UniProtKB/Swiss-Prot annotation, chain B:
Residues of the full protein shown: 25 to 399 of 938
Known function: Component of N-methyl-D-aspartate (NMDA) receptors (NMDARs) that function as heterotetrameric, ligand-gated cation channels with high calcium permeability and voltage-dependent block by Mg(2+). NMDARs participate in synaptic plasticity for learning and memory formation by contributing to the long-term potentiation (LTP). Channel activation requires binding of the neurotransmitter L-glutamate to the GluN2 subunit, glycine or D-serine binding to the GluN1 subunit, plus membrane depolarization to eliminate channel inhibition by Mg(2+).
Summary of the tissues where the protein is detected: Detected throughout the brain, in brain cortex, cerebellum, thalamus and olfactory bulb.
Protein's name according to its UniProt entry: Glutamate receptor ionotropic, NMDA 1
Residue positions with a glycan: Q32, N174, D210, N247, N271, Q321, N339
Binding partners and assembly: Heterotetramer; the NMDAR subunits are modular and harbor tiered domains that function in concert to regulate opening and closing of the cation-selective ion channel pore. Forms heterotetrameric channels composed of two GluN1/zeta subunits (GRIN1), and two identical GluN2/epsilon subunits (GRIN2A, GRIN2B, GRIN2C or GRIN2D) or GluN3 subunits (GRIN3A or GRIN3B) (in vitro). Can also form heterotetrameric channels that contain at least two GluN1 subunits and at least two different GluN2 subunits (or a combination of one GluN2 and one GluN3 subunits) (in vitro).
Similarity field: Belongs to the glutamate-gated ion channel (TC 1.A.10.1) family. NR1/GRIN1 subfamily.
Compartment(s): Cell membrane; Postsynaptic cell membrane; Synaptic cell membrane; Postsynaptic density membrane
Extracellular side: 1-370
From Swiss-Prot, chain C:
Portion of the parent chain present: 34 to 411 of 1482
The name this protein goes by in its record: Glutamate receptor ionotropic, NMDA 2B
Domain comment, as recorded: The extracellular N-terminal domain (ATD/NTD) endows NMDARs with a unique capacity for allosteric modulation, harboring several binding sites for small molecule ligands that act as subunit-specific allosteric modulators of ion channel activity.
Protein's job: Component of N-methyl-D-aspartate (NMDA) receptors (NMDARs) that function as heterotetrameric, ligand-gated cation channels with high calcium permeability and voltage-dependent block by Mg(2+). Participates in synaptic plasticity for learning and memory formation by contributing to the long-term depression (LTD) of hippocampus membrane currents. Channel activation requires binding of the neurotransmitter L-glutamate to the GluN2 subunit, glycine or D-serine binding to the GluN1 subunit, plus membrane depolarization to eliminate channel inhibition by Mg(2+).
Sugar-modified residues: N41, N308, N315
Organism: Rattus norvegicus (Rat)
Length: 50, 370, 370
């Protein structure tokens, strides 16, 4: 992992919520780069998201 | 008619007590008694059980725990040798959850509840102390998985998921990397489920990470209190103890009272055939035993010397009594009694870890998100 | 000189087995196996225990291969118990010693010759999908392995582009009393032309006796059953409906002139390869009594190598749960004259039937198009 820079429509919106709700944040990027879906894991009875 | 009932114990005094109990039950049909000691191995036990079954041709077998502390591998051969002919066997002082499966153990019932059933007391304590954030810590065994599944079902009954469940393999001597993860969470209530020999390593590691001071609440079971765990145990640990389970004799008297009520209803049916005395001769399945154990588990007993005797559809006990203990100044004191379905504390005062006297909230809200 | 025993039960060609035993040539490795044929009856499990004790104690027997001809299912459990109590590995080859096992012990060394439940389910699904049978239903009873079957079927039918149709899943209990009315009432809800089953022999006979009273077994209903439902092709309960499809293990052209030889070759090579590299061989005191301290030497390497063996251009590697992992399956059918006619074979996930179209045994028309 390497540090980068983030800005846009969803970045300045988190700052407004952080000032109104008075909390601290630490933004990072998703590893695999997907949104999320439920699949099957190693053909088992259980299912998980990604 | 005459029908004898057999059992297997390892004590001369227990044999005399069983003889006195069957003689007293004779005054309540004709029945006899049959007992045999324990062998230092398994195949000897199996051959002795077969020989005693051939010599007496009993219709029911009772078995308790040996003087061994584990009491797990001992009742294993008797179960197979008996259930080969599908005859009911009642357990007296067994606590493992392996005999709770109807597949591997078909004909087996319990008089005391197993270790996997001390999860409703914790649920009632959480409901009465409004605790909603807990940290489960079980071991990588069958008992741990059974208790974890029971607690997860009890929690999901109200649609409330646990925060995080952590596991550790048995025989571990360094769980520092595991406890370092449970300290970065929101909850402050730690539920532990391990063995007396393994719990001593968790207590010795928690005392180094300052996880046993104020604001923390420790909830454990019965096996985590006794043994060598009291040597390394911080104050405020709320343990559990069974009412009369530890003593053998109270049950033997109560066991012969409920099984005899089924024999009166056993001989009152048609197509009745006594089990064969051919432990060596036959290999067939006796017609009795599927209908015998059907009404045996449903035999509602009125009242005995150790409380009411009931049975669920799993071959286990029901409506047990637990004493909510508490450790203060290296001395356990009784604080409450679990009345089967509710918790009622007495006038004694409760002490919490750290030294303060106040019910912790068991939650520490953080102001840093990801 | 490794002592390998051979045990047979019931009527069998003892002279043919004795003649075919001297057919393996393992002179390329230092094995020099000793063979001791012994025959016995089917008196009782305790007789088997005494027999295996005497054989282990007679002369340095380090391995036993078991064969039988009866349809008893608890023989496998008894052999698993013996192989758990003793560190001598035993193998299941034929008869009751081949029937399926729920779960072995953690330290048990017992391997059977036969397919698992998932393999049979996959074979039946291939049979169904080859003849365009996309609508079916599942009915089974309480048995140690029904849940794996249902889970395997559901997992297979959820990730395919073809159109499956599953409905009316039943879990009826035949162990209850006076429930035949409820069984016959639920059973009338079936409407699919394909019905799967997972039971025992007597359970299947009773289920068919109840089903033929309703009448969904005459013309437009096909029944598929696993290998344990038939068991012995020589005997027929005369109540099985005509046209019963069953997948069984290969036993016609593969009797017992070579199974014992293959088992002896496996154990022998295993003992050789465990001796060559590790420069050691587990040869403790060959006794069955006082074996609580006989586990002083770790034998998990031999257990870890017994699941990897190849000889005479064949793959005999076992699996984690202890099945052949590569069997040769056949397909039989019950025709008018009550017998079993082989229809097709299955090997290496490759099904090869003999009929291009299934013979229907009027509202069945033909249609031509362009």
């Amino acid at each position: 992992t390497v540090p980068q820079c983030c800005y846009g429509f969803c970045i300045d919106l988190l700052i407004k919520l952080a000032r109104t709700m008075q909390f601290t944040y630490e933004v990072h990027l998703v590893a695999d780069g997907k949104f999320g879906t439920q699949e099957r894991v190693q053909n088992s009875n259980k299912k998980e998201w990604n | 008619k005459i029908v004898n009932i057999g059992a297997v114990l390892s004590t001369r005094k227990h044999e005399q007590m069983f003889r006195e109990a069957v003689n007293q039950a004779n005054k309540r049909i004709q029945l006899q008694a049959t007992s045999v000691t324990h062998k230092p191995n398994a195949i000897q036990m199996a051959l002795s059980v077969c020989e005693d079954l051939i010599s007496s041709q009993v219709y029911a077998i009772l078995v308790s725990h040996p003087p061994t502390p584990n009491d797990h591998f001992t009742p294993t051969p008797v179960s197979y040798t008996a259930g080969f002919y599908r005859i009911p066997v009642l357990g007296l002082t067994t606590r493992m959850s392996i005999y709770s499966d109807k597949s591997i153990h078909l004909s087996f019932l319990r008089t005391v509840p197993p270790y996997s059933h001390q999860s409703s007391v914790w649920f009632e304590m959480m409901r009465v102390y409004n605790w909603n954030h807990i940290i489960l810590l079980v071991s990588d065994d069958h008992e741990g998985r059974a208790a974890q599944k029971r607690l997860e079902t009890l929690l999901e009954e109200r649609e409330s998921k646990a925060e995080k469940v952590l596991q550790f393999d048995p025989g571990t001597k360094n769980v520092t990397a595991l406890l370092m993860e449970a300290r970065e969470l929101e909850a402050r209530v730690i539920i532990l489920s391990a063995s007396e020999d393994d719990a001593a390593t968790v207590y010795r590691a928690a005392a180094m990470l300052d996880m046993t001071g104020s604001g923390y609440v420790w909830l454990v079971g019965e096996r985590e209190i006794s043994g060598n765990a009291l040597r390394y145990a911080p104050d405020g640990i709320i343990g559990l103890q069974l009412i009369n389970g530890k003593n053998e004799s109270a049950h033997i008297s109560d066991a012969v009272g409920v099984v005899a009520q089924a024999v009166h209803e056993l001989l009152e049916k048609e197509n009745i055939t006594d089990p064969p005395r051919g432990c060596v001769g036959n290999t067939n399945i006796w017609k009795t035993g599927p209908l015998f154990k059907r009404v045996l588990m449903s035999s509602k007993y009125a009242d005995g010397v150790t409380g009411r005797v009931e049975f669920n559809e799993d071959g286990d006990r029901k409506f047990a009594q637990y004493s909510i203990m508490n450790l203060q100044n290296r001395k356990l004191v009784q604080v409450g009694i679990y009345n089967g379905t509710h918790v009622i504390p007495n006038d004694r005062k409760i002490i919490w870890p750290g030294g303060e006297t106040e019910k912790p909230r068991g939650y520490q809200m953080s102001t840093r998100l990801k | 000189s490794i002592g390998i025993a051979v045990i047979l039960v019931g009527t069998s060609d003892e002279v043919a087995i004795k003649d075919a035993h001297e057919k393996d040539d393992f002179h390329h490795l230092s094995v020099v196996p000793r063979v001791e044929l012994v025959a016995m009856n089917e008196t009782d499990p305790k007789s088997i225990i005494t027999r295996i004790c005497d054989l282990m104690s007679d002369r340095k027997i380090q391995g036993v291969v078991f064969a039988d001809d009866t349809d008893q299912e608890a023989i496998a459990q008894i052999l698993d118990f013996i192989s758990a109590q003793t560190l001598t590995p035993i193998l299941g080859i034929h008869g009751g010693s081949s029937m399926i096992m729920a779960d072995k012990d953690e330290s048990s060394m017992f391997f059977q010759f036969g397919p698992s439940i998932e393999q049979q389910a996959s074979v039946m699904l291939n049979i169904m999908e080859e003849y365009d049978w996309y609508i079916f239903s599942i009915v089974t009873t309480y048995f140690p392995g029904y849940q794996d079957f249902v889970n395997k079927i559901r997992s297979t039918i959820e990730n395919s582009f073809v159109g499956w149709e599953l409905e009316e899943v039943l879990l009826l209990d035949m162990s209850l009393d006076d429930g035949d009315s409820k069984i016959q009432n639920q059973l009338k809800k079936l409407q699919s032309p394909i019905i799967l089953l997972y039971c025992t022999k007597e359970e299947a006979t009773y289920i068919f006796e109840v089903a033929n009273s309703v009448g969904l077994t005459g013309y437009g209903y096909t029944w598929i059953v696993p290998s344990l439902v038939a068991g012995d092709t020589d005997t027929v309960p005369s109540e099985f409906p005509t046209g019963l499809i069953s997948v069984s293990y290969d036993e016609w052209d593969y009797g017992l002139p070579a199974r014992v030889r293959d088992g002896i070759a496996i154990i022998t090579t295993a003992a050789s390869d465990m001796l060559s590299e590790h420069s050691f061989i587990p040869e403790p005191k060959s006794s069955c009594y006082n074996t609580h301290e006989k586990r002083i030497y770790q034998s998990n390497m031999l257990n870890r190598y017994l699941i990897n063996v190849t000889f005479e251009g064949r793959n005999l590697s076992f699996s984690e749960d202890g099945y052949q992992m590569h069997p040769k399956l056949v397909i039989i059918l019950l025709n008018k004259e009550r017998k079993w006619e082989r229809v097709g074979k299955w090997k290496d996930k490759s099904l090869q039937m003999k009929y291009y179209v299934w013979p229907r045994m009027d509202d069945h028309l033909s249609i031509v198009t362009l």
